[PDB]
Every structure is written in C-alpha cells, then in structure tokens.
Amino acid sequence: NAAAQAQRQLALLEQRHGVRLGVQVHDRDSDRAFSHRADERFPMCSTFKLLAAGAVLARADRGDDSLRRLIRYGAADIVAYSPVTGPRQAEGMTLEQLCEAAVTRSDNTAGNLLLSTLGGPPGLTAYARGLGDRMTRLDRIETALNEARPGDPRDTTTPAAMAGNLQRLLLGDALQSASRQRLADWLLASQTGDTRLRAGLPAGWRIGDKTGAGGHGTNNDIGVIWPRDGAPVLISAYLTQSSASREAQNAVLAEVGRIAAHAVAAWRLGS
Numbered sequence: 001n002a003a004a005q006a007q008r009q010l011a012l013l014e015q016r017h018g019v020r021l022g023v024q025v026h027d028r029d030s031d032r033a034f035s036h037r038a039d040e041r042f043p044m045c046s047t048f049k050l051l052a053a054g055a056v057l058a059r060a061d062r063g064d065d066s067l068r069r070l071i072r073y074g075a076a077d078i079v080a081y082s083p084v085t086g087p088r089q090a091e092g093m094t095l096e097q098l099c100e101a102a103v104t105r106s107d108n109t110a111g112n113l114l115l116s117t118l119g120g121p122p123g124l125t126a127y128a129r130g131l132g133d134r135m136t137r138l139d140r141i142e143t144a145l146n147e148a149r150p151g152d153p154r155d156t157t158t159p160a161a162m163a164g165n166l167q168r169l170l171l172g173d174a175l176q177s178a179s180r181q182r183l184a185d186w187l188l189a190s191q192t193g194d195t196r197l198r199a200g201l202p203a204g205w206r207i208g209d210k211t212g213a214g215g216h217g218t219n220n221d222i223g224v225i226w227p228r229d230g231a232p233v234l235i236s237a238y239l240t241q242s243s244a245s246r247e248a249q250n251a252v253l254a255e256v257g258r259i260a261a262h263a264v265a266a267w268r269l270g271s
C-alpha cells in the first residue's frame, strides 16, 4: 500500500522535525493520491505568485489584459527580494516579464505589480473562488503576507486546495494551451527550489515548482512533477512551525520529494 506507506513516512518526518507539515500528492498516471493535513490552512508566502501568474494569463486568454502591456512603477514600489524589478524600475516591465520574474525568480515587487492588475488581494481571492477553490485567501501584499502567524487565516491555502489549482492551471482547462505552456515554462525554469522538492527527485525527472518562505519557520514548495516515464504528478508541500535553520527546512522538503517520487514509482511498477 504505497499511499499508506507514504503517509506514515510523512508523519514520522513531521514528528522528528517538530513541524506542522501539509502535503497533497496526486499522480495523473495511476490517478492515485496521498496526503497529510491536506485540509489544514498554511501560509502561502511566495506560492501565491503561481496563482497571480495564472490569473494574469487567464485575463490574457480572454483579452481582459495583455502580456505585452508595459507596466510603469516607481522606486517607492520596490520591496525586499526584488532582484529583477529593482534594477529595471525606470524603464518598467511588461506583464509577461513580471509574471516570469514573480514565478521563476520569486520577485516580490513583481508579485505586487501582478496583484495591482487583478484588484489586489481581493482579486486573487476571487480568482481562486472561480477555480472552485473555497479555501484560499489573499489579504495582504508583499511582504506583509509572509507573517505566517499560527491560527491566522490571512494569506493561507490548504495543500489539497492548492493541488486542485495546480491541476486546473497546468493540466486542466483553466488556461488555454499557449498560456498553460508559458506557466509550465516559468515554473520549470526556476532554481529557487533546487534544495527543496527537486533535490529529492530521481535523475531524469523534472519539477516545475514555486517555492515560498515566511515567518514562524514556514517553508513551502508546490508544483508539477514530470517523471522520466510517466504522466504529470501534482504536489503541494507546506511546512510551518520549524525551529530549525532554513537549510534544515529545505532538507525536510527534499525528503517530501523522495517520499512522493517513491510512491509514484511504486504505483507505476505495481509494487
């Protein structure tokens, strides 16, 4: 029973690190799933940028906005961890450049600029509702949204709700084909999760992921795994309440990646 074994492995991993760990995995090949705390709330932190890019792409699909539109912004708009938008402030950036900066590089000002085209955090929440997600809510902008206070509903998702969004966006009909590919490309080009889920994957497997990190020992990684020989796999991993270093948190997420990859391989072999 690969799903039961994966869930036991997650429970042991969570306990030995003193964290609260939320995971949802769904293999599109076997259609099998496993989870831990999949319906509990966790802070999104930078992972909201996946949804913000999805909402911008959906607007582009409908003609409600354009990826080629030039967005101007000021030095006053720059927030921490904005390595792309900061240097380009005087010239501005197009919406597609901002989507890429937010998703591939986790650029915080880029995330805020995307939100400014969507109606702010309320618009991102409305977008999640339109995807059938009744749990996710964004309430603050960068970097206030990273507070990650236990019990606080603001700026949270659930592992299952976010996995559902990943399915609709990357594998379902929430985006047209060209936009689906753009989002996959931005996720697959990211390096920010090299020591997180990706570090746990077998050679020849790929992940297009969106990382995040916040207060109260919060560290997240969500995305789509494309295995060496299998259909895609949805994965959402939210870790919080760690008292350990960032590197130690990253290693827990790498182990989640190993647990997930083994379950997928076992389903494929019929183990």
Ligand SMILES: *C(=O)N1C[C@H](NOS(=O)(=O)O)CC[C@H]1C(N)=O
Binding pocket: 044, 045, 046, 047, 081, 105, 106, 107, 108, 142, 143, 146, 192, 193, 211, 212, 213, 214
């Ligand atoms: C996202 O959660 N953030 C943006 C940036 N990149 O880290 S990530 O790759 O884990 O997303 C710094 C951490 C965090 C933030 N403080 O906004």
